[PDB]
């Protein structure tokens, strides 16, 4: 139940392939980081992806 | 349809063409008891009367004393019963 | 109130009348303190002590269908004065 607070990034699902084309299930996870950001109330620590931290966000 | 305490004529059965007086009414089973017809014997031993179907009796005309059908015409505010083949009120 | 339902007249209760003990059928969900205060206001009799017991439904079959009777609560009341005068 972990997701990016700014954008909403979440893990996905797909296949892992081999040279013989055998397929098994795997997951692509988001590069979430535990960073303190500005909040209206207490400044709390939330999951924010590294892409969201680009373009300029508070910390 | 056929009220109790009336004068009827039997048109079908063992005792056909015999006038009688209605003494009981069973509308759940559609059975009418006529006085003097359909005698029964019960081992208890007594002789009494049995029930007959309402479809085997016709009302008697007050004037001709002949079988007839029934109709309604709303003479008054209430509803009254008349007789076909004539105009006399039953 | 109408806590009491019916009086009980049996062979064992007949010999219990000599000791001023009366048997009644009461409501299932009442305590003997409530039964104590119900006799005093209907017959105007001062009571001494009240006993009470519970029963279980009995499986009674008539014809082809089986079933159960009602659960019964029975109370025995002891009187120091007066008499209920059951007819």
């Amino acid at each position: 139940g972990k997701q990016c607070f700014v954008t909403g990034r979440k893990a996905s699902t797909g296949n892992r392939r081999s040279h013989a084309l055998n397929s098994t299930k795997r997951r692509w996870n988001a590069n979430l980081q535990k960073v303190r950001i500005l909040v209206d109330g207490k400044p709390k620590k939330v999951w924010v992806s590294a892409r969201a931290l680009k373009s300029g966000k508070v910390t | 349809h056929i009220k109790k305490g009336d004068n009827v004529k039997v048109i079908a059965g063992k005792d056909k063409g015999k006038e009688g007086k209605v003494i009981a009414t069973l509308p759940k089973k559609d059975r009418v008891v006529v006085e003097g017809v359909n005698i029964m014997k019960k081992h208890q031993i007594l002789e009494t009367e049995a029930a007959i179907h309402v479809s085997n009796v016709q009302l008697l005309d007050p004037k001709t004393n002949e079988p007839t059908r029934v109709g309604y015409k709303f003479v008054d505010g209430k509803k009254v019963r008349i007789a076909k083949k004539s105009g006399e009120e039953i | 109130r109408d806590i009491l339902k019916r009086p009980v007249i049996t062979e064992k209760s007949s010999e219990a009348m000599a000791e001023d003990k009366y048997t009644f059928d009461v409501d299932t969900r009442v305590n003997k303190t409530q039964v104590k205060m119900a006799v005093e206001e209907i017959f105007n009799v001062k009571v001494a002590s009240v006993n009470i017991m519970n029963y279980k439904p009995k499986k009674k079959r008539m014809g082809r269908y089986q079933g159960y009777t009602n659960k019964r609560r029975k109370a025995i009341v002891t009187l120091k004065e007066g008499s209920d005068d059951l007819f």
Partner: protein, 61 residues
């Protein structure tokens, strides 16, 4: 469709509950338990009066 003759004041309604219920229906049941009661159709008659009495009482809130 019955005889709804009960039209007296609300104070007398409570007077008609202890009479009809507390002392009449209760007495009629102990009479039958030992067994002295003919006219057993009266048990239903008293019960329906109590239903009518409390129905008009609720109509007046």
């Amino acid at each position: 469709m019955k005889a709804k003759e009960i039209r007296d004041l609300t104070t007398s309604e409570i007077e008609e509950q202890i009479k009809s219920s507390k002392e009449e229906l209760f007495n009629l049941r102990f009479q039958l338990a030992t067994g002295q009661l003919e006219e057993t159709a009266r048990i239903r008659t008293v019960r329906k009066t109590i239903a009518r009495l409390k129905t008009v009482a609720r109509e007046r809130e």
